[PDB]
Amino acid sequence: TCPFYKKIPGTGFTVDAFQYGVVEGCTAYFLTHFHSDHYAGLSKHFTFPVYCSEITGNLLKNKLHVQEQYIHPLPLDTECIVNGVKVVLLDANHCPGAVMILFYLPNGTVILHTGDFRADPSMERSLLADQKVHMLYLDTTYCSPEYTFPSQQEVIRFAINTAFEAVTLNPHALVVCGTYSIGKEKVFLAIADVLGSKVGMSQEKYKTLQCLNIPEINSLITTDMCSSLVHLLPMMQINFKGLQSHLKKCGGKYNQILAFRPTGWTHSNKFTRIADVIPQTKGNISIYGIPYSEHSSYLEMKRFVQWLKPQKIIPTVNVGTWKSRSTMEKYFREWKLEAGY
Numbered sequence: 001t002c003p004f005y006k007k008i009p010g011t012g013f014t015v016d017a018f019q020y021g022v023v024e025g026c027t028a029y030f031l032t033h034f035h036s037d038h039y040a041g042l043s044k045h046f047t048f049p050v051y052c053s054e055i056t057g058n059l060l061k062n063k064l065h066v067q068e069q070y071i072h073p074l075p076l077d078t079e080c081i082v083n084g085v086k087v088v089l090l091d092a093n094h095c096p097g098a099v100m101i102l103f104y105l106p107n108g109t110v111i112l113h114t115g116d117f118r119a120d121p122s123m124e125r126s127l128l129a130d131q132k133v134h135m136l137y138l139d140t141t142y143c144s145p146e147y148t149f150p151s152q153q154e155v156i157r158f159a160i161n162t163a164f165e166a167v168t169l170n171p172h173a174l175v176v177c178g179t180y181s182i183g184k185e186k187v188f189l190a191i192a193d194v195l196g197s198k199v200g201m202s203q204e205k206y207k208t209l210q211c212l213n214i215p216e217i218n219s220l221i222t223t224d225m226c227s228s229l230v231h232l233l234p235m236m237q238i239n240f241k242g243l244q245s246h247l248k249k250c251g252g253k254y255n256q257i258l259a260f261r262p263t264g265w266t267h268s269n270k271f272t273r274i275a276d277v278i279p280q281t282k283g284n285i286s287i288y289g290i291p292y293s294e295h296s297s298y299l300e301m302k303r304f305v306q307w308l309k310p311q312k313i314i315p316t317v318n319v320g321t322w323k324s325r326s327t328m329e330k331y332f333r334e335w336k337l338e339a340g341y
């Protein structure tokens with residue numbers, strides 16, 4: 001049944017709650033972003049109002065074939081009325097089109113639902129600064145102190161320099177980047193840019209990218225694999241067998257693959273710096289796992305919450321075990337005591 005942490009008290013609203021059938025008493029279904037665990041259950045047969053960003057609305061229409069009359073896109077950073085309740089969508093710094101939602105309840109309570117986010121100090125100067133938030137529904141994916149990772153910028157720098165060195169040493173090397181959802185486009189776009197290539201990909205992936213309002217996108221991507229030296233493949237094919245196979249498909253145009261797997265966290269982060277990352281190599285194939293995250297680190301999450309000073313926190317991730325729930329509640333209390341709210 002719909003869990004309580006997907007329901008917004010005092011409204012008829014749910015968030016990211018499309019796989020429970022008809023939720024009893026729900027007048028509007030919000031969708032924070034186009035990732036499968038969140039949209040699971042939507043299709044062309046859905047007949048309730050869906051509220052989301054413009055980009056998420058492009059993907060609903062084009063990829064899932066939801067009918068237009070049920071898609072209600074909202075502009076960001078703008079006070080809007082939905083079924084008699086004031087709401088605002090804010091940028092979540094996750095994947096393209098991903099938002100956080102502020103709800104202003106009739107009784108005067110103010111609720112922020114983060115959806116999926118990567119907390120950033122720039123959020124401290126949005127419309128959030130302007131009033132108090134009583135309740136926070138929080139993306140707790142990496143709510144534990146072992147979870148450190150570099151900035152997105154440092155990671156991209158590493159990848160650009162690595163790729164550029166490799167292809168300049170060997171002009172017959174191919175670069176491959178794995179993907180399995182939207183997000184992390186910067187990785188393959190930045191590499192293609194330094195190499196003066198377009199990124200080549202399947203027709204399904206090209207369609208998905210054309211929904212995302214990325215400026216100058218027609219200049220950066222293509223379905224002609226033959227004219228590109230940066231290829232995108234399913235994350236599943238980023239392994240020695242899948243890459244050898246793919247190399248055979250290119251008709252002796254290339255004699256070496258350099259491949260990137262943008263993972264979330266991996267335990268080499270506990271010890272190793274970005275400068276120090278090394279690939280796994282077999283023959284003429286090398287695979288780099290790079291820690292490019294679109295979720296808050298533990299420290300970024302802590303800073304956001306200590307800034308916001310919420311009266312009550314409701315976690316939306318890692319809620320399935322008592323040991324996780326208990327550990328999270330302990331961190332929330334430390335943070336509260338340290339900051340004095």
Ligand code: NI
Nearest residue numbers: 033035094116
């Ligand atoms: Ni997500």
